[PDB]
PDB file of C-alpha atoms in Angstrom:
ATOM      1  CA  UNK A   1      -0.646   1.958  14.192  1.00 45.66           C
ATOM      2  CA  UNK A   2       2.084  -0.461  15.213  1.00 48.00           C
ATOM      3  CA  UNK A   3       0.043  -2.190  18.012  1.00 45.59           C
ATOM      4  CA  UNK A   4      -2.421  -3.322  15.495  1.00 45.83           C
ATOM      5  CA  UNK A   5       0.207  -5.372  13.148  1.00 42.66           C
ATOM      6  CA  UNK A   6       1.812  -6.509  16.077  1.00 43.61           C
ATOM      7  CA  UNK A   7      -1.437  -7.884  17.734  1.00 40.45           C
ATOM      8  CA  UNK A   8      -3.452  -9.053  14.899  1.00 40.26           C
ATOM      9  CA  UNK A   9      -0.537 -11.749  13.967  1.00 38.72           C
ATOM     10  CA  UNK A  10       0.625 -12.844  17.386  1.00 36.10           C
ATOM     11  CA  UNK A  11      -2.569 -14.186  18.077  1.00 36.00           C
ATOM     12  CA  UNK A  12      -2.527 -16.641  14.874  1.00 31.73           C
ATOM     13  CA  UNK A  13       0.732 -17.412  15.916  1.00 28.02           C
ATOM     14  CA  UNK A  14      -0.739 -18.267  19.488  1.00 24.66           C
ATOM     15  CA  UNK A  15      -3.369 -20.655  17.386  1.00 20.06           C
ATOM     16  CA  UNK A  16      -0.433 -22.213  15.063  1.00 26.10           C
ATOM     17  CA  UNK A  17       0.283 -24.170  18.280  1.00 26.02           C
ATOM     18  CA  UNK A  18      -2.981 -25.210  19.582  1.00 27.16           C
ATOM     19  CA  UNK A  19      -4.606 -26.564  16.295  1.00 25.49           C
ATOM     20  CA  UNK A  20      -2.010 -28.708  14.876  1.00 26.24           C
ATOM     21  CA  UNK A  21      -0.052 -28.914  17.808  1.00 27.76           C
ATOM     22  CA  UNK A  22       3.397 -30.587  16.358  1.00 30.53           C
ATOM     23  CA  UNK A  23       5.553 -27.516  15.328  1.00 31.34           C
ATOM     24  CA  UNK A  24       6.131 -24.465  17.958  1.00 33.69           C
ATOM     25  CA  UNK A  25       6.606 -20.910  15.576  1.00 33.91           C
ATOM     26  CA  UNK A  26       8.353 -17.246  16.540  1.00 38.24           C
ATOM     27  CA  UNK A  27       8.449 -15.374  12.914  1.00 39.44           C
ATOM     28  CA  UNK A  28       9.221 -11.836  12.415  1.00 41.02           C
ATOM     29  CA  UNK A  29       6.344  -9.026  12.929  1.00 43.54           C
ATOM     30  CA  UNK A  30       6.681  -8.744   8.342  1.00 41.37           C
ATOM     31  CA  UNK A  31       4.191  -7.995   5.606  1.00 45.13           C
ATOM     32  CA  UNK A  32       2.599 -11.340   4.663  1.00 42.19           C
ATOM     33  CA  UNK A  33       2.528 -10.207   0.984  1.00 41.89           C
ATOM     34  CA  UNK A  34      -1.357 -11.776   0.391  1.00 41.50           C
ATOM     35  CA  UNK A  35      -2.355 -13.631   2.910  1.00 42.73           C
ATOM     36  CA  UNK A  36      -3.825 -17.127   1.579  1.00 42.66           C
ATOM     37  CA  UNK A  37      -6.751 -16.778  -0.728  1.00 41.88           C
ATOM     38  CA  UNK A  38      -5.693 -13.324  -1.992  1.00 41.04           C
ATOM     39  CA  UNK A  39      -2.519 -15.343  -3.468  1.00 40.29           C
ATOM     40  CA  UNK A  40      -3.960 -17.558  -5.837  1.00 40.49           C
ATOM     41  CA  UNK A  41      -7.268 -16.325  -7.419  1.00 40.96           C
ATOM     42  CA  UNK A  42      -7.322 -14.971 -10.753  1.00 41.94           C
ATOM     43  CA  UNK A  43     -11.107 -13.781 -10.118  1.00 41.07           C
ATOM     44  CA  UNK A  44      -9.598 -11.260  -7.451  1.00 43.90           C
ATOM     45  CA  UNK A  45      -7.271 -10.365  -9.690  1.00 45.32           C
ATOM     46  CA  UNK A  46      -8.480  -9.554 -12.725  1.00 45.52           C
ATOM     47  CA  UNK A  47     -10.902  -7.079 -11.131  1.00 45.35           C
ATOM     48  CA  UNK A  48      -8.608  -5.270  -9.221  1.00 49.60           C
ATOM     49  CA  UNK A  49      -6.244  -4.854 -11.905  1.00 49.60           C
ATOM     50  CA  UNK A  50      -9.169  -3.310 -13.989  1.00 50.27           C
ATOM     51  CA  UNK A  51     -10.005  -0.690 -11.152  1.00 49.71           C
ATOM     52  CA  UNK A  52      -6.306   0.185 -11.421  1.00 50.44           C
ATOM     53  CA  UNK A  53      -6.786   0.696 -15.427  1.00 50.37           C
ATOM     54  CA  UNK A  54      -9.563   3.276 -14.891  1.00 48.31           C
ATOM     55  CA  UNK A  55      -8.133   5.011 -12.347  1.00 52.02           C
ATOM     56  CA  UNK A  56      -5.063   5.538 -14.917  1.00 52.95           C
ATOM     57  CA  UNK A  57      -7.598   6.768 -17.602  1.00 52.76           C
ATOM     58  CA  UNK A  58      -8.800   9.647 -16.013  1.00 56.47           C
ATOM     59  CA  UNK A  59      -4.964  10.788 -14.718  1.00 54.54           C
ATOM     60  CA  UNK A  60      -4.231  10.406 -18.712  1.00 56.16           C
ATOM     61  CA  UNK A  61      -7.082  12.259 -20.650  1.00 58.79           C
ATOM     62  CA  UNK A  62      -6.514  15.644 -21.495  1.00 53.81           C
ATOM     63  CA  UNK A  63      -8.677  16.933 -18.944  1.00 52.82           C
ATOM     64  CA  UNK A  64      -8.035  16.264 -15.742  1.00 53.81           C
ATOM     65  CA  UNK A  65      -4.528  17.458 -16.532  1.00 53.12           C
ATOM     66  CA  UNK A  66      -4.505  20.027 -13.441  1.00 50.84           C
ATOM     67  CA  UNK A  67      -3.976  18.395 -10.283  1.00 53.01           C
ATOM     68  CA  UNK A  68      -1.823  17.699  -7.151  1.00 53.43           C
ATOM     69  CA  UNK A  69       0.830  15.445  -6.390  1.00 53.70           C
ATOM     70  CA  UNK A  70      -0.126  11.761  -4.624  1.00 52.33           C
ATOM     71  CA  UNK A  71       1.515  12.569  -1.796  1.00 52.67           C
ATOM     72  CA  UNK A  72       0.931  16.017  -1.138  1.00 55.10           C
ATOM     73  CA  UNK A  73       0.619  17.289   2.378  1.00 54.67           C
ATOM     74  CA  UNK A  74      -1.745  20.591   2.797  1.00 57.28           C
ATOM     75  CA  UNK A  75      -0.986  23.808   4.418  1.00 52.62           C
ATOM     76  CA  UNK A  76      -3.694  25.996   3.716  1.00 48.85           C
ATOM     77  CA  UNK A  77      -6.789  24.432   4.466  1.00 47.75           C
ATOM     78  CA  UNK A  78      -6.350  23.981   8.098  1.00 49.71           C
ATOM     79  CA  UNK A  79      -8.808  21.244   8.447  1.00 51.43           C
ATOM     80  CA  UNK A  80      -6.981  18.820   5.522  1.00 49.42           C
ATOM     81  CA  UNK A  81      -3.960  19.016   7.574  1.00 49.19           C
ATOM     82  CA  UNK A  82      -5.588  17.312  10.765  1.00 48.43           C
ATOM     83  CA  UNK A  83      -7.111  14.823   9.010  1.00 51.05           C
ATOM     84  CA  UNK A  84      -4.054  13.555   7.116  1.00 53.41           C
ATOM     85  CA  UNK A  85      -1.520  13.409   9.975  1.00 55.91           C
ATOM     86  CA  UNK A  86      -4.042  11.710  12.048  1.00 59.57           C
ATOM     87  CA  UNK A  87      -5.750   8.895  10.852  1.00 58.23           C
ATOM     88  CA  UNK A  88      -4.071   5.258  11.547  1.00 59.50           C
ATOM     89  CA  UNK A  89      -4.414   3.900   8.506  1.00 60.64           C
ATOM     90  CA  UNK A  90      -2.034   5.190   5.576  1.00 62.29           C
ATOM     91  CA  UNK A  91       1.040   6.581   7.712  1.00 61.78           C
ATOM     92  CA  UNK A  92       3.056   8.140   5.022  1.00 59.66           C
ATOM     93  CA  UNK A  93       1.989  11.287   5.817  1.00 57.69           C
ATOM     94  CA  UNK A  94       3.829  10.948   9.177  1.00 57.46           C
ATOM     95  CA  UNK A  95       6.570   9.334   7.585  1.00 57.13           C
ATOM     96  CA  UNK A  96       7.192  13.047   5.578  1.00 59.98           C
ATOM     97  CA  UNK A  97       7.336  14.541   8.646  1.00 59.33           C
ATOM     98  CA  UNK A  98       9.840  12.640  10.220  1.00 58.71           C
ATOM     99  CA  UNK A  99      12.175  12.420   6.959  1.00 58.62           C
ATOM    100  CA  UNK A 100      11.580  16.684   6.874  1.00 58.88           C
ATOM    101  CA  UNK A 101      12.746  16.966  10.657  1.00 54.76           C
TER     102      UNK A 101
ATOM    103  CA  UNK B   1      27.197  37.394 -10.114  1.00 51.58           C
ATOM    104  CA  UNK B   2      27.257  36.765 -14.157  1.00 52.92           C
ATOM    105  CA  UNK B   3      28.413  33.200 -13.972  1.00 55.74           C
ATOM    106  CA  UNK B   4      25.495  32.315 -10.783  1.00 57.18           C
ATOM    107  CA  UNK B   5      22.346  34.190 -11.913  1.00 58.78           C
ATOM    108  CA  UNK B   6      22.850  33.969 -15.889  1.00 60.62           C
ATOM    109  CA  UNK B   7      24.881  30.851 -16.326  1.00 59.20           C
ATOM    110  CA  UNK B   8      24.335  28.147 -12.967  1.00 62.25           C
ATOM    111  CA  UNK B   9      21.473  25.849 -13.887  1.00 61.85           C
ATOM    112  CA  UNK B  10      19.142  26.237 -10.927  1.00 62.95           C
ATOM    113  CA  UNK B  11      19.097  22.598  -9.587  1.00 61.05           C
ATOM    114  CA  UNK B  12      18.960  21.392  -6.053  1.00 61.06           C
ATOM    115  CA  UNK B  13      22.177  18.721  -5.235  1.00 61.22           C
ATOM    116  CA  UNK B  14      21.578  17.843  -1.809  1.00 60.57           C
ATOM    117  CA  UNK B  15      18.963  16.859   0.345  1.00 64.02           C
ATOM    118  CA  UNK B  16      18.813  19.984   2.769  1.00 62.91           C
ATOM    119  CA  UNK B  17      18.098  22.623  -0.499  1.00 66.02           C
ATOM    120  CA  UNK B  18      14.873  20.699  -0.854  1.00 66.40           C
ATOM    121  CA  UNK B  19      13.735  18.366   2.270  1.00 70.93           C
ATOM    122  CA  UNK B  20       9.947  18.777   1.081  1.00 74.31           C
ATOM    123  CA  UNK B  21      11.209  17.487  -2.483  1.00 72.11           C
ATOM    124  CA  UNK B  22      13.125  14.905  -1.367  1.00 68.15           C
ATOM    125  CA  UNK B  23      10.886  13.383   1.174  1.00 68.33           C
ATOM    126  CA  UNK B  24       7.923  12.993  -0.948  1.00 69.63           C
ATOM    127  CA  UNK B  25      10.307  11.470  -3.559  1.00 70.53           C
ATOM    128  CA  UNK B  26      11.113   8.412  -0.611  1.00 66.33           C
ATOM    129  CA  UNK B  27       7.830   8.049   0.889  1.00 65.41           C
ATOM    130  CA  UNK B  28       7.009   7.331  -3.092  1.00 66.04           C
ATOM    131  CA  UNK B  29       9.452   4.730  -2.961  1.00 64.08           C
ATOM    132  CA  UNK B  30       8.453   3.015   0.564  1.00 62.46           C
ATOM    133  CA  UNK B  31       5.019   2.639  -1.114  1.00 61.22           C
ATOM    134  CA  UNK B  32       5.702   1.079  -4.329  1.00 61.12           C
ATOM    135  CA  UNK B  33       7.413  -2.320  -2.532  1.00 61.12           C
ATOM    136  CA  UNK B  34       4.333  -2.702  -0.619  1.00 58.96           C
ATOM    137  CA  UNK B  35       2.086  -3.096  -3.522  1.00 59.50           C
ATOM    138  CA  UNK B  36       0.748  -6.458  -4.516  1.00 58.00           C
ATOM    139  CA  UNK B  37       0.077  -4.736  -7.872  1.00 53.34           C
ATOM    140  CA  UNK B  38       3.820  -4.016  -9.074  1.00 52.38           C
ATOM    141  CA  UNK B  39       4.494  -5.202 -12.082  1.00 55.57           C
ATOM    142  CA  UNK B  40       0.587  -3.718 -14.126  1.00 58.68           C
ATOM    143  CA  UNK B  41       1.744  -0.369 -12.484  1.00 58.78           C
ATOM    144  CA  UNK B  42       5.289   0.406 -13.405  1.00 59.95           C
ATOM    145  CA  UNK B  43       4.277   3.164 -15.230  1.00 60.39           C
ATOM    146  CA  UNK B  44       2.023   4.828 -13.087  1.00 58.89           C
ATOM    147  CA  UNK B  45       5.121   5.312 -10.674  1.00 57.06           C
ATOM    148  CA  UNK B  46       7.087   6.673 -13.224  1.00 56.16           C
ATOM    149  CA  UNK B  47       4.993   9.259 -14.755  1.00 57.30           C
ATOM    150  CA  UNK B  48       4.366  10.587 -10.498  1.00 59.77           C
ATOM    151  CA  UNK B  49       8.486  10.641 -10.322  1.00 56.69           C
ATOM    152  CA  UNK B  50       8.510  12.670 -12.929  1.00 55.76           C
ATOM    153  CA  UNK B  51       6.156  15.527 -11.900  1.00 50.80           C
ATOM    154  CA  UNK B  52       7.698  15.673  -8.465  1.00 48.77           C
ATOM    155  CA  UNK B  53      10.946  16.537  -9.892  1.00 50.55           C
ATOM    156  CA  UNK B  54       9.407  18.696 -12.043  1.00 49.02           C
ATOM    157  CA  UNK B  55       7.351  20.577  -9.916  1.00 46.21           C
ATOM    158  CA  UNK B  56      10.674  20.861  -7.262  1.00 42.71           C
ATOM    159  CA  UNK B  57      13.731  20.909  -9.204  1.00 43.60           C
ATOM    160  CA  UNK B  58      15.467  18.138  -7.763  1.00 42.92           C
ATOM    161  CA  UNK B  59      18.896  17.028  -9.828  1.00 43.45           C
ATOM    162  CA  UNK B  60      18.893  14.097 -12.004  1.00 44.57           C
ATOM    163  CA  UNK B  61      22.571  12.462 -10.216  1.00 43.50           C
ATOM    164  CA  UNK B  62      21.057  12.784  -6.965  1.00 42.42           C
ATOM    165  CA  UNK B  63      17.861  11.227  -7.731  1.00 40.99           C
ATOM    166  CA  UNK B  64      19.602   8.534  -9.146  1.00 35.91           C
ATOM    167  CA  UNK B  65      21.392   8.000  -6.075  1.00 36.98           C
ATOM    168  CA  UNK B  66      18.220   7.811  -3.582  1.00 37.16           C
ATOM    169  CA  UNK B  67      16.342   5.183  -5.745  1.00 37.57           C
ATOM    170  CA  UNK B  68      19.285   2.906  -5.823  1.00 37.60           C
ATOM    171  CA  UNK B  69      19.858   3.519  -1.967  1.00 37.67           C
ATOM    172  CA  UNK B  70      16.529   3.093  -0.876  1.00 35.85           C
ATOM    173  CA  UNK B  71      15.795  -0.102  -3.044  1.00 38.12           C
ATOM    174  CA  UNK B  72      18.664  -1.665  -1.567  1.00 39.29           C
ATOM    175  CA  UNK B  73      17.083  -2.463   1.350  1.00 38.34           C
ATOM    176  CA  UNK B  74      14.249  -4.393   0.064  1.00 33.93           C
ATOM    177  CA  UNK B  75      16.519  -6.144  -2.624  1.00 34.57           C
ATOM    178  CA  UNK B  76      15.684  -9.522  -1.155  1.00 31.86           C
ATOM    179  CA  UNK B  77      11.896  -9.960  -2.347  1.00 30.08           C
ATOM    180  CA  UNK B  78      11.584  -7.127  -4.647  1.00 30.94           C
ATOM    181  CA  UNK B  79      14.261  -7.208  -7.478  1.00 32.54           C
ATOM    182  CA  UNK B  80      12.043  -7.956  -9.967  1.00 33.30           C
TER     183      UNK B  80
ATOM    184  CA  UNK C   1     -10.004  26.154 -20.022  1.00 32.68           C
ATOM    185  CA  UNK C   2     -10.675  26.961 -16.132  1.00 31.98           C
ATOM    186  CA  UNK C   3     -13.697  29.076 -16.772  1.00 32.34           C
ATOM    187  CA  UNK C   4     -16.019  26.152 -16.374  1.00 31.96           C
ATOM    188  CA  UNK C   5     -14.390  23.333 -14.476  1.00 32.50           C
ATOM    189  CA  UNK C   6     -18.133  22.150 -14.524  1.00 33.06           C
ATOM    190  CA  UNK C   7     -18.794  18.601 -16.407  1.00 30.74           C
ATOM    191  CA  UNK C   8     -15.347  17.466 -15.405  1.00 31.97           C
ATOM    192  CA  UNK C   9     -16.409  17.543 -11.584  1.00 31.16           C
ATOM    193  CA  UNK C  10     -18.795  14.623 -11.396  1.00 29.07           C
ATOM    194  CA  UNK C  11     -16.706  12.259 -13.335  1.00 28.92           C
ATOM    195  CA  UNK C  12     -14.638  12.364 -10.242  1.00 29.86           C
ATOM    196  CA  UNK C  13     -17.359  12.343  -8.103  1.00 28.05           C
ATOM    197  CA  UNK C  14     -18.174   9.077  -9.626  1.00 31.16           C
ATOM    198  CA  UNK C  15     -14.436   7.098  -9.066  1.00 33.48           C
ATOM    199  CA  UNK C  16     -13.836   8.435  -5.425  1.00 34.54           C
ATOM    200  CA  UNK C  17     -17.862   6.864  -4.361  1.00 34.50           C
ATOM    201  CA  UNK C  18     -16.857   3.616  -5.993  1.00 33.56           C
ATOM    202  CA  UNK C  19     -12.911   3.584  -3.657  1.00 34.96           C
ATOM    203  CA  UNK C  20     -15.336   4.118  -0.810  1.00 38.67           C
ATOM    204  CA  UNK C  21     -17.428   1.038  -2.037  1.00 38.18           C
ATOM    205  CA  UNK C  22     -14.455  -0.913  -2.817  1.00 38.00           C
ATOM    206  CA  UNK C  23     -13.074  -0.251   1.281  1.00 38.83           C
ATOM    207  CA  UNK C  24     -15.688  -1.163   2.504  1.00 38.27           C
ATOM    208  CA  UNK C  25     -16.120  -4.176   1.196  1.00 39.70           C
ATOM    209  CA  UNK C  26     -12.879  -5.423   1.705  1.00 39.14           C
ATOM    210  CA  UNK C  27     -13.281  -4.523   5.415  1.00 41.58           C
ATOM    211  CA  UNK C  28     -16.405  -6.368   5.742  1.00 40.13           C
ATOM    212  CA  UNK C  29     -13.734  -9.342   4.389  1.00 39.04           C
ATOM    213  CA  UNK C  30     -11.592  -8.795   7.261  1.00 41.03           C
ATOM    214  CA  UNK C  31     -14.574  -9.153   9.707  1.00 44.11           C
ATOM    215  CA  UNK C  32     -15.863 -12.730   8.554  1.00 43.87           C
ATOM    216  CA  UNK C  33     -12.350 -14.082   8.629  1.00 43.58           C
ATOM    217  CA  UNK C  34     -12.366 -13.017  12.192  1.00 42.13           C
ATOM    218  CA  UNK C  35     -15.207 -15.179  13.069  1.00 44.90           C
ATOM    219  CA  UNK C  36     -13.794 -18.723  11.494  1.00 43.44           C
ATOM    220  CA  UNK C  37     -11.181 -17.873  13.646  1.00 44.98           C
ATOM    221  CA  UNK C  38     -13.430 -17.535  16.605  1.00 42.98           C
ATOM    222  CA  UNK C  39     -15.309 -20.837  15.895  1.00 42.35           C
ATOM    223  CA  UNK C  40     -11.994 -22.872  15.148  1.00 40.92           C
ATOM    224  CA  UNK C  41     -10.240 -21.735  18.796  1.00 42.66           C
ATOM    225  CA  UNK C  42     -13.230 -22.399  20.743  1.00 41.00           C
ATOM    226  CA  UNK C  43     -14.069 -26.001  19.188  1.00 40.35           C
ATOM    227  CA  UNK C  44     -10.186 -27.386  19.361  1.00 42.38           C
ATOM    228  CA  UNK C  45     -10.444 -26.202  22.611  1.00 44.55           C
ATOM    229  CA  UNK C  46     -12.584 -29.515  23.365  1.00 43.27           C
ATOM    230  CA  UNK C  47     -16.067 -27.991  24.428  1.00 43.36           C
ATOM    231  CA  UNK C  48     -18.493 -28.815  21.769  1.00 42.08           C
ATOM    232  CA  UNK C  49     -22.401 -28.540  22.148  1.00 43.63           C
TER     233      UNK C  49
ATOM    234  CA  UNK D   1     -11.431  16.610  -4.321  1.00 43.73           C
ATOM    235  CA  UNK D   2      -8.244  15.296  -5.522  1.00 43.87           C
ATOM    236  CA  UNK D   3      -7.130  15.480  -2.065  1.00 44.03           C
ATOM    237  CA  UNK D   4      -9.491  13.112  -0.538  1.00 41.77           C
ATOM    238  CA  UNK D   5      -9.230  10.720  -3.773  1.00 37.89           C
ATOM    239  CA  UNK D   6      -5.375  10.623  -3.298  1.00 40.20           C
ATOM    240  CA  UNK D   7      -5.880   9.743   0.704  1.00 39.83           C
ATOM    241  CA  UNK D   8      -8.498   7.031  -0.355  1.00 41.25           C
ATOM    242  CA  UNK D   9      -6.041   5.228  -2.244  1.00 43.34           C
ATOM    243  CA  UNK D  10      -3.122   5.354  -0.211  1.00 40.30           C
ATOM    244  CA  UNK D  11      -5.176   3.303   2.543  1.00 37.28           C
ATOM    245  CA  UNK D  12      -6.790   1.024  -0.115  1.00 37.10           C
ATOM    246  CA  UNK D  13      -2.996  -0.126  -0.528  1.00 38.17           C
ATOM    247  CA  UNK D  14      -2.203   0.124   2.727  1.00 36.65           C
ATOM    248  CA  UNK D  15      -5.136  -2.703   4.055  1.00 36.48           C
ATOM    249  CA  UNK D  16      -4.161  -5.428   0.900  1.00 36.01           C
ATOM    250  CA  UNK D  17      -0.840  -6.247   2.333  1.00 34.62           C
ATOM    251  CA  UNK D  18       0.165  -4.613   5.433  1.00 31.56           C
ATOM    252  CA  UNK D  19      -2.780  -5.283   8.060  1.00 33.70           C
ATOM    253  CA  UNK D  20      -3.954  -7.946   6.040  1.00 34.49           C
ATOM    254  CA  UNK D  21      -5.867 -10.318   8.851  1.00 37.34           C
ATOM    255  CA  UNK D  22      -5.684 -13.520   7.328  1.00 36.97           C
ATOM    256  CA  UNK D  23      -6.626 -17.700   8.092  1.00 35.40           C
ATOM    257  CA  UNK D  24      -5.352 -19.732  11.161  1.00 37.09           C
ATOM    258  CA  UNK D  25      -3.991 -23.085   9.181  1.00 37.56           C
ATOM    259  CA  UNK D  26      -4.724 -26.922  10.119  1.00 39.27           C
ATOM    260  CA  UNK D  27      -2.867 -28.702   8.050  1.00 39.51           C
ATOM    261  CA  UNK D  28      -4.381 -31.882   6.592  1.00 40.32           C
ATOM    262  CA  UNK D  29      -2.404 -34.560   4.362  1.00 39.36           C
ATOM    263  CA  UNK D  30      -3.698 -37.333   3.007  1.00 36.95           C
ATOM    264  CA  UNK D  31      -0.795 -39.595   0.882  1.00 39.12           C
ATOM    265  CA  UNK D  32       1.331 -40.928   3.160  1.00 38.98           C
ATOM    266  CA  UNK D  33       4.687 -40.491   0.630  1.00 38.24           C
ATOM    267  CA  UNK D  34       4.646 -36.619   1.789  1.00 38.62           C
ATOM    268  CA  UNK D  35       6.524 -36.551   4.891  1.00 37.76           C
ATOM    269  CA  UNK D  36       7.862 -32.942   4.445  1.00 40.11           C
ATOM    270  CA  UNK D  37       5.823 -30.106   4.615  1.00 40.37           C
ATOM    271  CA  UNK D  38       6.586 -26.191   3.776  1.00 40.06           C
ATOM    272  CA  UNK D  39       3.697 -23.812   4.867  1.00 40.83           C
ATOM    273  CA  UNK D  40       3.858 -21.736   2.317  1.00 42.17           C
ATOM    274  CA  UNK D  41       1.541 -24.208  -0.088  1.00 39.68           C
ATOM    275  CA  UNK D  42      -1.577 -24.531   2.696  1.00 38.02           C
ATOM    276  CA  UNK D  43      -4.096 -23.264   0.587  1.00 37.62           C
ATOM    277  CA  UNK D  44      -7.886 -23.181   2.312  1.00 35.71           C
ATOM    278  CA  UNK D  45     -11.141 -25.371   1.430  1.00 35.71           C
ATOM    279  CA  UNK D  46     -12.623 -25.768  -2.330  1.00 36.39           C
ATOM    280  CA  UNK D  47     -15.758 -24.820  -0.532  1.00 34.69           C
ATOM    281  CA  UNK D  48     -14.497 -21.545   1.347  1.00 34.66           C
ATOM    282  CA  UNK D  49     -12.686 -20.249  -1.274  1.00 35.86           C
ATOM    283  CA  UNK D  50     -15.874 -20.123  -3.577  1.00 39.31           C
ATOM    284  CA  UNK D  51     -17.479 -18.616  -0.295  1.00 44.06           C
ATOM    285  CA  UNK D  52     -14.757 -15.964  -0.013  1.00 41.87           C
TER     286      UNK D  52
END
């Protein structure tokens, strides 16, 4: 999971230097908070804040009012538990585990 | 055993009496400053800190104490 | 309240197939940016054609 | 259900910000009363962005 962030922006750092070839770069391996077009665009925006507003709808009617906690890990259902602590994508379900240990 | 099982509010005060409370209550924390959505969502993090401390009791001083020690740490871009 | 858990099943149905939509999108986003970035190293490279 | 709804959105937010691939940036100017230049301001093409 950390050989992906660490290869996906040392190669635009590699191409920094080629294209306008005046100014050499080493920056930190960080979260580049949105990355240029996601920054400024209020039609990206404005329809991802209104996913978000539905989503809180349903987790505030008075029927869904019966559920688990965001991040709950599994115990029983053996086949959950394999398929949380494995994929390389979220990695806060590995992050429990170390924190419980 | 009158003034522990009749009178002693049943609260956890450290984080060994409840490491499967207390670690979902960080890993809560470590996700909200990497949202780009952070300031239409304030409440939606609320409203899941309280039903984890709820569901585990978990102490109000202590909790306290881990949300002002873990935002600490990202203090320099997220202090709004 | 339990008894039925019935009509309150595919209204959930129906928010988890559009997160799935909304993924993949978004990862079909990170695979076009990938290719200007293909294009723009190999023509600043100087071999044109 | 709940269970695979909660997983979905944890790597929804964990793909806007933290993999994120993003542009390589060639800076073009064209005043010539710049002469400083942050790269934090490089914003891409009128005609890419309505693209993207």
């Amino acid at each position: 999971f950390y050989s992906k962030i660490k290869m996906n922006n040392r190669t635009r750092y590699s191409l920094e230097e080629a294209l306008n070839t005046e100014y050499y770069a080493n920056y930190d391996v960080m979260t580049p908070k949105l990355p240029v077009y996601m920054k400024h665009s209020n039609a990206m925006k404005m329809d991802r804040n209104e996913f978000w507003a539905n989503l809180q709808n349903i987790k505030e009617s008075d029927d869904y009012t019966l559920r688990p906690t965001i991040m709950d890990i599994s115990l029983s259902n053996t086949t959950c538990l394999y398929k949380q602590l494995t994929q390389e994508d979220d990695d806060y379900y590995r992050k429990q585990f170390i924190l419980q240990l | 055993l009158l003034k522990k099982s009749k009178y002693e509010l049943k609260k956890y005060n450290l984080l060994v009496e409840n490491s499967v409370g207390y670690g979902q209550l960080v890993a809560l924390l470590i996700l909200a400053y990497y949202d780009p959505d952070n300031f239409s969502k304030v409440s939606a993090y609320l409203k899941e800190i309280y039903h984890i401390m709820g569901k585990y009791s978990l102490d109000s001083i202590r909790t306290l104490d881990v949300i002002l020690n873990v935002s600490s740490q990202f203090i320099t871009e997220g202090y709004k | 309240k339990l008894e039925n858990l019935k009509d309150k099943l595919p209204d959930i149905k129906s928010i988890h197939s559009k997160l799935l939509l909304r993924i993949g999108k978004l990862q079909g986003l990170y695979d076009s940016v990938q290719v200007i970035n293909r294009e723009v190293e190999g023509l600043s490279e100087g071999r044109t054609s | 259900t709940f269970e695979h709804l909660n997983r979905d959105t944890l790597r929804y937010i964990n793909l806007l910000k933290r993999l994120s691939v993003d542009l390589a940036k060639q800076v073009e100017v064209s005043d010539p009363s710049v002469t400083v230049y942050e790269m934090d301001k490089w914003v891409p093409s009128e005609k890419l962005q309505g693209i993207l």
